[PDB]
Design a protein around this ligand. Sequence first.
Ligand code: Y01
Ligand code: Y01
Ligand code: Y01
Ligand code: CL
Ligand code: CL
Ligand code: CL
Lengths: 367, 367, 367
Amino acid sequence: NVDAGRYFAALRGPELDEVKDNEDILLPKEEQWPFLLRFPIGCFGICLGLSSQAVLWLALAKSPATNFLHITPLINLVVWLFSLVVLVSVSFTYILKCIFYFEAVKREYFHPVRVNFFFAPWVVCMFLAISVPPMFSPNRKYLHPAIWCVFMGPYFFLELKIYGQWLSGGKRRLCKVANPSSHLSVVGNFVGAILASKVGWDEVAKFLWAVGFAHYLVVFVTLYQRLPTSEALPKELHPVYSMFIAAPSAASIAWNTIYGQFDGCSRTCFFIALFLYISLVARINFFTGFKFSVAWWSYTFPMTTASVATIKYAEAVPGYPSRALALTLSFISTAMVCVLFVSTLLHAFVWQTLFPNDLAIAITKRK
Amino acid sequence: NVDAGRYFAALRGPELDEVKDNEDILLPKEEQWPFLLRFPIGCFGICLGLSSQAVLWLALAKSPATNFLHITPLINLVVWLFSLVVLVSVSFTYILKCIFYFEAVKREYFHPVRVNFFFAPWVVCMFLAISVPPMFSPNRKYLHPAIWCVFMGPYFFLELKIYGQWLSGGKRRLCKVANPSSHLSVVGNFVGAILASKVGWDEVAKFLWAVGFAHYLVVFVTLYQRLPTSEALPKELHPVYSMFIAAPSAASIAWNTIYGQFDGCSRTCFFIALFLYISLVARINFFTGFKFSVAWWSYTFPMTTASVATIKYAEAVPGYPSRALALTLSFISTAMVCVLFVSTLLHAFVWQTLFPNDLAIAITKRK
Amino acid sequence: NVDAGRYFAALRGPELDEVKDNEDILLPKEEQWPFLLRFPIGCFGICLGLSSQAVLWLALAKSPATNFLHITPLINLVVWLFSLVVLVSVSFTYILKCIFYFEAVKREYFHPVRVNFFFAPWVVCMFLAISVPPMFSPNRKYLHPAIWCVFMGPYFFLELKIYGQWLSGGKRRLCKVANPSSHLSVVGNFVGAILASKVGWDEVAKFLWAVGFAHYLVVFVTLYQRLPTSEALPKELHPVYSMFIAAPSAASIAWNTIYGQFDGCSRTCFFIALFLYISLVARINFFTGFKFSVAWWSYTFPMTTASVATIKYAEAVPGYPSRALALTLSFISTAMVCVLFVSTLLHAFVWQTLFPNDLAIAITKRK
Ligand SMILES: CC(C)CCC[C@@H](C)[C@H]1CC[C@H]2[C@@H]3CC=C4C[C@@H](OC(=O)CCC(=O)O)CC[C@]4(C)[C@H]3CC[C@]12C
Ligand SMILES: CC(C)CCC[C@@H](C)[C@H]1CC[C@H]2[C@@H]3CC=C4C[C@@H](OC(=O)CCC(=O)O)CC[C@]4(C)[C@H]3CC[C@]12C
Ligand SMILES: CC(C)CCC[C@@H](C)[C@H]1CC[C@H]2[C@@H]3CC=C4C[C@@H](OC(=O)CCC(=O)O)CC[C@]4(C)[C@H]3CC[C@]12C
Ligand SMILES: [Cl-]
Ligand SMILES: [Cl-]
Ligand SMILES: [Cl-]
């Protein structure tokens, strides 16, 4: 199939889903495509945004810190049930695409940007597994190991192949193909540590942490040098950079679980995430220039994971300065989801513009 | 204004302040320029060299180790007072340049090498703040927080903008623009930790350490790969490389303050700094080939900060081998300052060659 | 002498010892060269493979874990004596080459790949020093310091020059010259820590660890970016990549010695090494496609050092899952040595093809 050199020279845009002014495609543009062909793999971001909020709201209802508010536990029950409904629908609809349009899927699997989104279905399931409502699992001492193996099996199996082609001469190297959204494949390992520690296997959790950190360091520095991938890193500051915060925030939570309390290895990761958050939200150009797009839902994923981590920090350092920080980050992140949630409905049933023709999968081979 | 691609293709030299044999300038060469236009931003290195010695001499007079010598405390009093006099003069003179020659300053602010020297004024003030003579501050329990905020405010505010343009598509990236003297912008955070810990705020000090380390790692590796910046890294070994030692040495001192005693996180940073020091001074080509230049004063900054760190190491591991190391590094560094101090006076009033025409700010736009 | 730009444009092959289909050489091909000229520096891999096995077998005979097997100590005595015999022969034969063919040696010293093999003679001696049979050294409390200085002297002295030319403008930089086998120069420091800790000097061991880690991180990331060195990184997966495991495995053992027990700093390094091992041996393409070559002996070096580290891990976490892992890795690594040992003899006296003409040292200057 087409390489990424032909995917970086015909598609331009921060997410790279936009045809340039010279390229030619193989399908009619004005004509309406079949619904299945117009269903991109970027719709899984909806599950990521909703699932993360379920984890965050549980912390506000069970954590010893932030207790005076008296947050009822029904928020997690309502959010968790609704989140699962969407996941069972997007996954079911996508499967039909593979059976009837397996040819189109292979095009996305080679897309430089959409490759890393294949991990979303497994990551989303993990969040709903480590934040199950207390009502459904009363007297829960330790989760059965089967949950970890089933959901951490397919991820790890596909983990080896992608990670193994970065140190090679094949075209798909970390240098030839890379982008700000490349962290989505290295965040599962950190998130998987929490699930493992909740089933009884503690040594295994340490294994995932080492794997996650080693690749994150490589994937972090590589996005500061001159890499063949051009037109992907947006000029100035763009929301696509929010994925930088997903990794450090998740890593900090993992350490607090295996080793019980914040060591020097938990605060430092948290402080790195906080620095990036300030440099991406403490700007008057962030709350003024906003355009609704499907990719936005995926950008709330790292702005909500930080809120979960910050609450844990406030638990080990009680005080007014810490409470304000924890109770303010969780408000900005939750506010964005509410705005996005209302906006999506209007574009679905009022304007009918959520699923336009996907011109990024119709680039002709060669020139 | 001119970019750095036009600043890396018309200026050649280790510090990059020297016109090539083909470029044309916009100002007369033989004619003497106004004094203000001939006052470069590189003169702030004088304050850095003198201020650091004040910190080092205090350690030799208060530290439990190195006590048999019976070093009087008057050395700090004399050095500290003289250091402040120079700072109040260079800063005052430079300010007049901005009012009358703000146009010239903007040229320096875009210079690939002189950009990182804007942090010197704030870093110099910190050294004189964490090494105040005991006489002036008797019964000193903890410094007022106002000192940290006032001096760490302007640095952090300008910290976000430069650090934020490295991960972007703008011309000023860590790859397009970089050089051995790029560590001067990542050393303030480590130095700022010491000041914060001396006013009562200890958690804040941890925040700066994480920020400092994250950027240092990125700025360390990036100077080993092939980066568009050419003609800046001198062939063979050059004194400009001494800035590599400023970062690790300052970081080690910070850890000893927040966490009290040398953990594994303090010795390892110290040993990295020691290795670089040996590879840059254990050479017969270092003490034989010496040419007086203004940039030399800034090269003593990292050769004196190590002496402060080594004394702390000798405090936790008493013994003859440690005492010799601490009492020998502080002698080489102090000897260079004395030689430079005498040499500067001769070039100021005997030869009158300290401030020649600055041809590096007269490069014509384009070709 | 010839640079590496002329060594990367006339030699092609995973180890780079194979002339391309267009280059011209300066010596007859059909004619048989003198035996000395046909003796490459790659023969030292034999000592590395045999010496490592001596260390591993000692652990199986003294370590509290893996005791039920009742492994006799005579295995170490027989292997150690035989290993020393080979070392005293290869070293003696090579020395004669320098006296009579010093001109040829300089060509190898500038070879991009064969430069890092000059460290083998010193590394091999260390293994036979930290694994001396108990019979030869009864009532051994601490080894004399002279052993460390004699064997760690020449390595460190040559350590400074190579490490010092990576951060420079000279042709031999980490970017212009690099390859998967570049870890052989950064593994001595980690191995040298164990020897130092066995003579009484413990603080010195910490110094080597910091030096080893700092260069390994630089040498690790640099092999993921686009570096002028092309045709050296084999396409797909190749055994040359096994050198990635030598560094982390050796580092983990060092920490367990200086600080007594596995901290968080030992398990994490071990887990990184384990991940790389799985991605290079858990493949049906590894045990099926095998071709005998001299470079193979050097590839068993990192597959045996891991077995030594894993046994130590099983000592701190007793249990059936740990015992199986330790007793299975040491079987695959030892099996390969037995297969290679038998194969080498046949190619030496039955087929007579171990030392063919070395065409890689006859590349004409320029084109
Ligand atoms: C990969 C780059 C972009 C930075 C982000 C990765 C972090 C996970 C790394 C960077 C440095 C590492 C730290 C290096 C120094 C220390 C201090 C060290 O201090 C202690 O002595 C622990 C016990 C204590 O005194 O509390 C604990 C480990 C830790 C935090 C390390 C944990 C992991 C850190 C934060
Ligand atoms: C960025 C690159 C060029 C290296 C320089 C950065 C250092 C600040 C990093 C590199 C590795 C880190 C270390 C990784 C391993 C350890 C060992 C670890 O050992 C312990 O178990 C601490 C308690 C003890 O046993 O003393 C303490 C943290 C520390 C020193 C880390 C502190 C920070 C270090 C030295
Ligand atoms: C260079 C890249 C490719 C990774 C391989 C280098 C490792 C040697 C570095 C990476 C991160 C470092 C670790 C960063 C975080 C920690 C956790 C920290 O946890 C503790 O709090 C120690 C005490 C304890 O709780 O057991 C101990 C140091 C350690 C293991 C560091 C040791 C050295 C590590 C494993
Ligand atoms: Cl949680
Ligand atoms: Cl001090
Ligand atoms: Cl051992």
